[PDB]
């Protein structure tokens, strides 16, 4: 073995978490430099949630309306403005613990770490993937609104997600740090549900490569397959169709281990059709798909 669902060290994010309160509603906010970011939902009361008019609701607020606190210290809000589904509150103090950072919008299939928070205080960290249907299978209780998803490239934090809500299907929906939702969802408690989800094919192959590089090799075979035939099978089991771009990405992992991507596809195909018959691949009993090629390369060498 030797393969774990690793999350990024949360320290740099922890130092940016704060509590933002408006009226009786409270949730988390990101404190970077002299600005605090939080879901504009904080300004909605129970009833407002059914069909809020954010323009309407915000214009009735002043800076005094926002109670932002860092631990047990009231942070003063000297300005406020709305950007899509987020609110940018200006505070009269700069957060010294502010790390080097970037706001990026990730693509479905990509992975990121989540720092679950409540009342602006850290509760736990976990790694997860942005499902193909734009939702996320998170362990998000309620009040977690405002928690952020992120990646850490060296000492630069790339914020990619800000939690917003839980969908009736049991999964979660959020936005990037620009306020744009990931998926066809809105800041409103109404009938909603993401499109059909699929297994992330690119990741599963990276995972199987991880097992091979880590010694496991039982699932390989002499069989062969073309890109199209592999897709015709994969589509039957609800896997994302695999493009030439996905196989080229698996190039590094291919060189190492010396297994051609299509051959690896030949192994997965057999796997999809015969379960594992009691066998485990890298400790697991199911095809894991929350590991990107980059993740795998990072964990087996970095």
């Amino acid at each position: 073995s030797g393969f774990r669902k690793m999350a990024f060290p949360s320290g740099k994010v922890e130092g940016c978490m704060v509590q933002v309160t408006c009226g009786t509603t409270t949730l988390n906010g990101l404190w970077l430099d002299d600005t605090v970011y939080c879901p504009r939902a904080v300004i909605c009361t129970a009833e407002d949630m059914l069909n809020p008019n954010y323009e309407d609701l915000l214009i009735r607020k002043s800076n005094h309306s926002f109670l932002v606190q860092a631990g047990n210290v009231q942070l003063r809000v000297i300005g406020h403005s709305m950007q899509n589904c987020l609110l940018r509150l200006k505070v009269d103090t700069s957060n010294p613990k502010t790390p080097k950072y970037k706001f990026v919008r990730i693509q479905p299939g990509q992975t990121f770490s989540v720092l679950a928070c409540y009342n602006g205080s850290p509760s736990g960290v976990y790694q997860c993937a942005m499902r193909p249907n734009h939702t996320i299978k998170g362990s998000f209780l309620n009040g977690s609104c405002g928690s952020v998803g992120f990646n850490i490239d060296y000492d630069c934090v790339s914020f990619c997600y800000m939690h917003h809500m839980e969908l009736p299907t049991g999964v979660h929906a959020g936005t990037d740090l620009e306020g744009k939702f990931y998926g066809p969802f809105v800041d409103r408690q109404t009938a909603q549900a993401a499109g059909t989800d699929t297994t992330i094919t690119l990741n599963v192959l990276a995972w199987l490569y991880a097992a091979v590089i880590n010694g496991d090799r039982w699932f390989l075979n002499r069989f062969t397959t073309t890109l199209n035939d592999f897709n015709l099978v994969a589509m039957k089991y609800n896997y994302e169709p695999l493009t030439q771009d996905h196989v080229d990405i698996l190039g590094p992992l291919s060189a190492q281990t010396g297994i051609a991507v299509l051959d690896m596809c030949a192994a997965l195909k057999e796997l999809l059709q015969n379960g594992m018959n009691g066998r485990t691949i890298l400790g697991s009993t199911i095809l894991e798909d929350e590991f990107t090629p980059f993740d795998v390369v990072r964990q087996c060498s970095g």
Partner: peptide, 8 residues
Amino acid sequence: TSAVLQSG
């Protein structure tokens, strides 16, 4: 049967 904006 409805979305819940998980605020506290």
